[model samples]
Target: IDCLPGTFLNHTEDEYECQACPNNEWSYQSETSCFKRQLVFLEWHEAPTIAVALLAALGFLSTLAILVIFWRHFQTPIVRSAGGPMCFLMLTLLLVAYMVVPVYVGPPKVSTCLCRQALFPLCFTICISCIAVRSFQIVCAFKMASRFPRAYSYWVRYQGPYVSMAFITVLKMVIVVIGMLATGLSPTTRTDPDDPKITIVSCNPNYRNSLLFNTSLDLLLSVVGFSFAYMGKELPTNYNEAKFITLSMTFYFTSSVSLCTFMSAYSGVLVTIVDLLVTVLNLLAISLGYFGPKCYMILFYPERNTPAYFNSMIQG
Candidate 1:
């Protein structure tokens, strides 16, 4: 028989048509052609992105307000207190760095040359250092409270906050230099093997060291904050320093803990939401911390904290 209008092709997707048969005939060994409709898929996520954007805005505003409070109280004893300005300065830098990150670039786009070379390291350093200072703060509290009074005094008198800032900033620079040379940030965006249509993004480095940086610093902060909170109970001077320490430590704990649920998830919409929430809380902590004291002073001791009673009224 000639290869006429219906001849079976023997392909997996082919069928046969029976000649000299009516509607009941199965596809016989006489099929001319068999065509298939293309399959399609779609993926979209909205909640995660919206949540992240919302948190970023909140964090930015809160951090700004806290910075303003510091400027207004530049000469106050709190500003001069052990680790006060240092913490404020680093937090400010961290907030600014984080805020500017989204403006300059974003994820996936990070696979590009500019982001890989410049943006990733900058972002990583600021975040790591921000955590580092928390660890340093905790260490300072613990050493000072124990037999190492000399160490505490030395830090306050010699190292001071400015000196500490210089030390860490330099250290971070060294880490970044080594990271750039050794790891050499490269493109890390590609399609998922299981699902080629989906894309994945990660930092291409010999070693990330970001988790190490984060965990070490975070542990330090946790140890210090918890230690101070525990030992501060018996301290004198109405436990003013202890109270401040405890408050600051609580801020760190709260911010870190709240994001634990989000961090538990892998890099997807959930992680994005958690990242955004962490940023927002960090920003809010400063504003809430400053304003709480300011508000309390105005309400209870109007004349003392403010210039006048009338001014306090207006201020409140």
Candidate 2:
């Protein structure tokens, strides 16, 4: 293999050098350098693959476990309301999308445009549904304080979740599609002339400012979420749920704002690192708070909280 400065993972004139494994074996892989492998070629050779694979495995198991719990817990008044279980399911599915996308999407291309279009909805649905569920739960709890037994039944109403999800999904698609058509745009990729080996793919959203629509939806959901939390204060004992919702939102919003700031100032190495960090953090938030907690509760404390609502005989 030929050696070139800054090319730690070297590709030979006839065959490429593989640093995917220890001791530098020969194989086809991304990020090949000159004959001599560059320091960068080796630095990233294994770390990303390991990280992504682990996340995917954990995400899959957590989601599957949650589904199983929901299935067994079905038919109970509380279980019948989708809020309790569906929230976790929706979030898990969203996290799965993030995990799966990178495994298959190695940089941007025309093929990934559909994924680009689709991801907006996946992300929005998860966030919106989460806020919606918490809001609805808070409201139901608020009503219960008024001696309305119906409060418990309606708060987690299973039907509301589907309606919320369907509405968000359809609305996002309509807006994105129309935005694209109006702006005479669709997601596409361009080859980096400076680095043909690398492809730069990005979502254009048709109009340069289409992000306004995206952010608008986010703002709307945020408003509803906070409103529900504020309303929860009127309820006794259930105020904690509302408080938790508020706290969670505050944390995420801060993190998201910080991410935007970092992105604005980043370039080259910093950009890559920041982008990767954001992706991991985004997944961690969902997998940990959204999916991990319930999984832990279900697996470790089955006695405390039977997954089946009917088996437990809890009347919502």
Candidate 3:
């Protein structure tokens, strides 16, 4: 008689023996041969990934289109007031973040794992740093410049926005570098106790619990950015970004919270996909909210792009 499915039968001259399938392959009771367990990952060209990638592709087109739009109208008052160099910095950070999505979807590894982890947080820090500083500058210009002339002068002459971005950028780099070293991020072929027949490919750090640490800066940035934006609510219509900035921060905060809940509740492809979707849409929300109106005017309303239109809007 032959052996069962989980084992192989060794045929000897005078004896029949059933040998175990060793460490890798597995099979149910009483079958001919052992079979390997299935591997699950975020596959490319599959239904869900294709759909998600499509959204990413659309985001790329929209961001680049707006970037080009901003570049073409670099000299205009609208672009200047939108934080000219800061706007470019925001676009570049976002573009880099968008580029990392494919790495998240592609095969998992140490390098890609580092890329996936480090790039998103750093990109977001720089982008939100711009938003927060921009809002503060608006507040200072409209409200504080008259009441607190010396403080406004210190802010302007010392390049407050430039220094603020650089400081935050360096701080996040420190956090990511230390976080990576602590985690030793590497791809793992993890199996579940509940379902041994399926293996999963993922780059999960042992320090996943410490992830909430890195988010500390963004939490601070978003709250501060939102506060400044909120303070600018009564400012003139042209310079006021209270509505757009608040909405962006609100959506971003919601996504961040949702991500943690999902991460805690699940793992594997679903969490990976949710992570990528959240990152991409966070950029989309910020870019659309910040630049959407400017892009619309730059494209459709030539007369409205002029300084006179801004001057008229400001007088109110």
Candidate 4:
């Protein structure tokens, strides 16, 4: 006879009738039942989901605090030197990125899928673009000052970082829009061929075209940002955030590579969980590395916020 969900057919007592299988046994088709099939999903109270969510929440709050601190100290030289409005915008985007993680915790749907697909790229591109602009600014301010003084002065005085961030963000939006229009955004369900009982449902993105475009752009920005930051490392600490930018990019690149590698081998709730953690970690790393020192100097060493100290630091 045919078997039920958690039981196999036991024909020892009766040849034609079915019986209950052992406690751990389960059947997919007919008489075959084994403990090999696994039902996997991160539950609400599970460690992976709960712990990562906690960490993300902490990071979200940390970002909020940093934003407040930046606003209050907006006039400070240290704050202005750390990218100013562009930096504040990046922090805002980072907060949005943190808010986006909770969307991944729930079951996959068109709404959540669309949020993940659109928001992640938007938030990160803006943040990384800000970093790239800041890095390029440092390079021009230091290395290109003597060679192209007029050009460098023009950029610093007028063009600034917003133009660069805006251009990059526009490009990303175009890519995302085109990809969605071409492929259409939707939730996709996949069942294991060997074990049909287990099913996975998630967002189906255009891997080769849209995803690759985003990846390549981010990679290019990361490389260029890091290289420029490294090149400007010897500049005055007060004027150049190169050290922090370099550290932030290093953390970002390492996390991105690990996440990509893990994602290649796995998909499902676990991937979502890992993705949430990774995003939070990357944001936290950048926040702490870049803004952490400025915040510290503002809070703990108010004396160092003086123009005299800044002028001394720049001159020496």
Task: Give the best candidate by TM-score.
Answer: 3
Candidate 4: segments with Cα more than 4 A from true spot = 1-42, 150-158, 192-195, 206-213, 267-269
Please estimate how well model 1 matches the true structure, expressed as its whole-model Cα lDDT.
0.46
Scored against the true structure, residue 140 in model 4 reaches a CA lDDT of 69
Backbone clash pairs for candidate 3 read 5-31
Q: What TM-score, computed on C-alpha atoms, does each candidate reach?
A: 0.55, 0.59, 0.84, 0.80
Candidate 3: list runs displaced more than 4 Å.
Answer: 1-21, 27-33, 141-152, 192-194, 206-210, 267-269, 312-316
lDDT of 4 at 106: 63
- lDDT tens digits, residue span 1-316, model 1: 4333223343444335233322222223354434322222111255555555666676566566656765676544443432555556455554654454353224434345444345434543443344344445544545564657766666566554445545655766675566566654564554333432344454454122443333343346455445644464344332133454456557867776656644554444233334445645554554455334543443455344433433333322
* Residue 156 local lDDT, model 2: 44
> What are the lDDT figures for the candidates, one per model?
0.46, 0.51, 0.74, 0.71
* TM-score quality measure for candidate 2: 0.59
Supply every candidate's count of residue pairs whose N, Cα or C atoms clash at under 3 angstroms.
Answer: 11, 14, 1, 0
Model 3 Cα shift for residue 155 (angstroms): 6.1
Ranking by lDDT: 3, 4, 2, 1
